Amino acid sequence: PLSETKCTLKSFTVEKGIYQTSNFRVQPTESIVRFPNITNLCPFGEVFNATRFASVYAWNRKRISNCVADYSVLYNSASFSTFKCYGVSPTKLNDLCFTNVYADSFVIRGDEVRQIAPGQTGKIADYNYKLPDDFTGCVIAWNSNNLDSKVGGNYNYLYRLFRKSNLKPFERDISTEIYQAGSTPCNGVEGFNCYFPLQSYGFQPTNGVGYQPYRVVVLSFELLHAPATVCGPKKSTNLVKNKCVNFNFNGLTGTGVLTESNKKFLPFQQFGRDIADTTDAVRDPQTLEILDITPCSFGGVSVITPGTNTSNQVAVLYQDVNCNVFQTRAGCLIGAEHVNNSYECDIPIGAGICASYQTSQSIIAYTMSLGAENSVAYSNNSIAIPTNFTISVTTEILPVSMTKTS
Amino acid sequence: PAYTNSFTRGVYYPDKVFRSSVLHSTQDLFLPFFSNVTWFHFDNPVLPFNDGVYFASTEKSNIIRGWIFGTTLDSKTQSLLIVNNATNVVIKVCEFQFCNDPFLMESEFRVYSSANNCTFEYVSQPFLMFKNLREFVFKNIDGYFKIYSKHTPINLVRDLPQGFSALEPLVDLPIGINITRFQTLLALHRGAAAYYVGYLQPRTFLLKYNENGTITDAVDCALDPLSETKCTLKSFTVEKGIYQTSNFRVQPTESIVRFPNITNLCPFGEVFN
């Protein structure tokens, strides 16, 4: 530990005083895994190509929860070609646990796969399907050429074609007469400038690969605000205290010691943070207790030095490492025969604790001293008169100018 | 017509990513505080989107049976359905004809006009079973559809209650019919209604999440020059002082283009004539 700032100044010589080291946690041991108990792995029959996922204006909704979420149980059930993920990692999905998850099916046309995206412009953009820019999840289309291609033209879904102006983001729309764009209104008679937006498809496999349909799932999931139990399938371990281990509580990792508290946490609220942007209270969903992540990074180190060429024995100041040791007040003082005398200071520690190298011999530390506090004459009728001389001077250097720069 | 103060409501999460006790800001669309709101009742006319919907229902009534989010009212510009069959949230997405005024010893089934062209049917747990007060958020740009509500009994039956409350992600839907206008749905049994529709537009908020990760306060970056400072010191409470925050200028109007004097006179046209 004396040889630790020779390389901090990157040199083969260290000076005298007190230096610093690398960090101080306390030596780590384990990595516990904590997942809630839902038996259900999520069934993916009627979300991914079972028999019929109907209109471009009508998706097959199922509220998906109360199951264990996993990502490698898709590729069997459909003929996938495109995986396009946002807000999230494509494969850290069993390394997490979400909150209020969805798996969301629809179908697109083959010439305009391109503007199924947050706002590519053109004919893809004011008459169908619309969500804001802040979406976390994947976008998944797949090959399908058997069931949705007849011999006489596909008349199995409508699409709405006309609309005037713009919107805010997220909704749906019924109502359904002949559209009016400009002048000469309709009133249900279908006159001129009263357009007929329901116009015949041509989806056939004889029509080209650019004229095919493409069924698209867009995955939808969010991280930890409602209390959820949806957590992935990498099964469970025990639960420990007074140590700094890896955990995973419902999708937020960390680095800290789980200690006990006594507070009345409102029992429908999963996690929390305190005043300075760090997670203070963590919920486990098995035993119904709230743990406090005490951040396990805690500690500082120092080392009292004379150097290498002079000697090779140590005096220690393990500052925030609790504890031939002694205990002075800027740190745990080992390498240090604590003596009972008092002399001047060479290497200070604190509160008048200094260390030095005095009298095999080891570096010693001690408490420092002012000098001779005495009791000389207080007689009322006296006054103190000095008269002798052996002359020399009391020097100091004093600085006039220095260097300029350009 | 029948304007009332839009006090405090019109919030939602951008998504559910975890952050707590941290004053966080995004660029999204929200309700302008201290604006008007559309109090509509006996009569239920059609309403254009008008770049904004923040729906609010009334209490004393389980009478409202969903919505007619609209274009033109027949069967020609593809369709929704949102109702309750007194046990479940029935969402047809079927193409029903011109129920401009659909109404319902149980009288019902006038809204069923053309049962043809059904391409989604839905049954789930109902949205709602001094009465609970429904409020909703209704939009469209690149994807899905929201259901965001919370229900609380209170006094002041017609006017908006004050007090601040969050909204919650319930039910989210990739449907596919980009919107012009709207209209409501109610019932009868054998029409004295009340509701509200708000408006939101793109505007920066600063959001407070509580000690537990739940909305308890927010401010607006355009309501006053006061919260402008709150929008740039990332805090509610600022100290007595002075804060340079933002800047202005004068927009251009005409945008002229000026070029030298005309007639350099190509003799190209002589060979045509």
Binding site: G350, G352, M368 | -
Partner: protein, 369 residues
């Protein structure tokens, strides 16, 4: 700042893009830890002008002058003092997480007060002897009397008005916690210098939501979503703004850093002069003629208590700069002459007490007219 885990964090290839590449975050450490030793050295000579504790005497019988506000007392954990009890709850604050660290100071807040507890003793005990060396005795009443001869106050008056000085001094000391018991903004320069570090740390961390031309703000998506023999370009630009933000943070600290020492050398010098030696330079420690000080602790500073001799209740007396008597001038040894319109008198400059025009109080030279 541990540099690589601020830039990259736990990734080989991000570090292996960072090593065609000399010694930036080497010298950024040697920038930052270079300053880090110096504030402890700034803490060093700002108190340690003595060489152990002077123990205050156990009897507290100093001529009626109360001192129960500035000594430490074992009611607290044996080390903090009474004004400081009011102090250390009036400055309230980052965290330990990704990227950063907080080393402790050299000395601890318990033993910063240890030197202060030493300093108040000797300047009550022996006075400015211990600025020099060995310290002779003095009792506190006559030292104050000997203290007034610095500013021309004739030192009889402190013996002559010992009781009236007492309660005025005492209630003034109790007034200074009264000046801070409610609220002051004057804590001020203490409060922001901690606070501007916190936002500086906060504006350090808030950088890491950047995209900076890349398609992400996290590392591992760039590993995942595209190809590592082409998407290292997506790493490649993401390095440098983080390197820039670190470059700014070392910079904008460094300007304020030795700006503190440039304030602190002024602080230690007032600790050098106005604690030890009864100085003459006016307007230098408290408004008024300087008398003595008494220093206390602080979270990152020092708070002085000064004491000034402020005149009051003036009464203009008729004066003249010269007296002729048997053709010869008469000039006062110090002070000037005054008269109450009727008879002339002799006094000093800064406290009123007449005497009689004598041969003693004057000296003669020169002709008259």
């Amino acid at each position: 700042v541990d540099c690589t885990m601020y830039i990259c964090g736990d990734s080989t290839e991000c570090s292996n893009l960072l090593l065609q590449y000399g010694s930036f975050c080497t010298q950024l450490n040697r920038a930052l830890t270079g300053i880090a030793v110096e504030q402890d050295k700034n803490t060093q000579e700002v108190f340690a002008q003595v060489k152990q504790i002077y123990k205050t005497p156990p009897i507290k019988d100093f001529g009626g002058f109360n001192f129960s506000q500035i000594l430490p007392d074992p009611s607290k954990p044996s080390k903090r003092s009474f004004i400081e009890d009011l102090l250390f709850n009036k400055v309230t604050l980052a965290q330990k997480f990704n990227g950063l660290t907080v080393l402790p100071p050299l000395l601890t807040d318990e033993m910063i007060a240890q030197y202060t507890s030493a300093l108040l003793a000797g300047t009550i005990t022996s006075g400015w002897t211990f600025g020099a060396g060995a310290a002779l005795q003095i009792p506190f009443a006559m030292q104050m009397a000997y203290r007034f001869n610095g500013i021309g106050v004739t030192q009889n008056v402190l013996y002559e008005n010992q009781k009236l000085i007492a309660n005025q001094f005492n209630s003034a000391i109790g007034k200074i916690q009264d000046s801070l018991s409610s609220t002051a903004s004057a804590l001020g320069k203490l409060q922001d210098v901690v606070n501007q570090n916190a936002q500086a740390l906060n504006t350090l961390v808030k950088q890491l939501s950047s995209n900076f031309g890349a398609i992400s703000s996290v590392l591992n998506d760039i590993l995942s979503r595209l190809d590592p023999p082409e998407a290292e370009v997506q790493i490649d630009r993401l390095i440098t703004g983080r390197l820039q933000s670190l470059q700014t943070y070392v910079t904008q600290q460094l300007i304020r850093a030795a700006e503190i020492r440039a304030s602190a050398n002024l602080a230690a010098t007032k600790m050098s002069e106005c604690v030890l030696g009864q100085s003459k330079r006016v307007d230098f420690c408290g408004k008024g003629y300087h008398l003595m000080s008494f220093p206390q602790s602080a979270p990152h500073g020092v708070v002085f208590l000064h004491v000034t001799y402020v005149p009051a209740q003036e009464k203009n007396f008729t004066t003249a700069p010269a007296i002729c008597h048997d053709g010869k001038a008469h000039f006062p040894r110090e002070g000037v002459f005054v008269s109450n319109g009727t008879h002339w008198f002799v006094t000093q400059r800064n406290f009123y007490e007449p005497q009689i025009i004598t041969t003693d109080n004057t000296f003669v030279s020169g002709n008259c007219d």
